[PDB]
Design a protein around this nucleic acid. Structure first.
Ligand SMILES: [Mg+2]
Ligand SMILES: [Mg+2]
Ligand SMILES: [Mg+2]
Ligand SMILES: [Mg+2]
Ligand SMILES: [Mg+2]
Ligand SMILES: [Mg+2]
Ligand SMILES: [Mg+2]
Ligand SMILES: [Mg+2]
Ligand SMILES: [Mg+2]
Ligand SMILES: [Mg+2]
Ligand SMILES: [Mg+2]
Ligand SMILES: [Mg+2]
Ligand SMILES: [Mg+2]
Ligand SMILES: [Mg+2]
Ligand SMILES: [Mg+2]
Ligand SMILES: [Mg+2]
Ligand SMILES: [Mg+2]
Ligand SMILES: [Mg+2]
Length: 88
RNA sequence: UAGUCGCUGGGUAUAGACCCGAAACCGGGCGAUCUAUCCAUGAGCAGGUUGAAGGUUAGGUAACACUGACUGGAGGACCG
């Protein structure tokens, strides 16, 4: 549901090596933006299970990436959790 | 082959007709200061319990859900 401009400004805001789209932080930010964006769509369309499957897949991907990042570096983990405003 | 009109008595008819005695029917009125409903305007209900919805907060959820604590004061509720 994201746009080209939205993704570009997200990666610009969260890039860590001036051209890295694969670092955990960028992917986590993109997934969080998409999850937050799809909420209002699912507010109106409660009977759309087929898309909610993809939403759950994105949630699982974000969870796994956060777990890996926490396992690797605690400081970057805490910083990312702080900026994204999510519990854990 | 004598009837008529009085008077006095015994009967009869129509009248309450020897006297007392119903439950009832019909007509015009009087009553909702009792009581039954209703309408307007007032006032009365000591004292003590229980504790719904809701709210706040801390968790928790992708989000809605869902838990605890505090609060709150419902009811043809409870004891009197
Ligand atoms: Mg004579
Ligand atoms: Mg005579
Ligand atoms: Mg006589
Ligand atoms: Mg007589
Ligand atoms: Mg008589
Ligand atoms: Mg008698
Ligand atoms: Mg009468
Ligand atoms: Mg009377
Ligand atoms: Mg009266
Ligand atoms: Mg009565
Ligand atoms: Mg009154
Ligand atoms: Mg009282
Ligand atoms: Mg009541
Ligand atoms: Mg009531
Ligand atoms: Mg009653
Ligand atoms: Mg009662
Ligand atoms: Mg009682
Ligand atoms: Mg008593």
């Amino acid at each position: 549901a994201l746009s080209v401009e939205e993704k570009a400004q997200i990666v610009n805001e969260y890039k860590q090596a001036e051209g890295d789209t694969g670092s955990p932080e960028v992917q986590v930010a993109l997934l969080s933006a998409n999850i937050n964006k799809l909420q209002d769509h699912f507010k109106a369309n409660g009977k759309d299970h087929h898309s909610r499957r993809g939403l759950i897949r994105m949630v699982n991907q974000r969870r796994k990436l956060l777990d890996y990042l926490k396992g690797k570096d605690v400081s970057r983990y805490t910083a990312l959790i702080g900026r994204l405003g999510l519990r854990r």
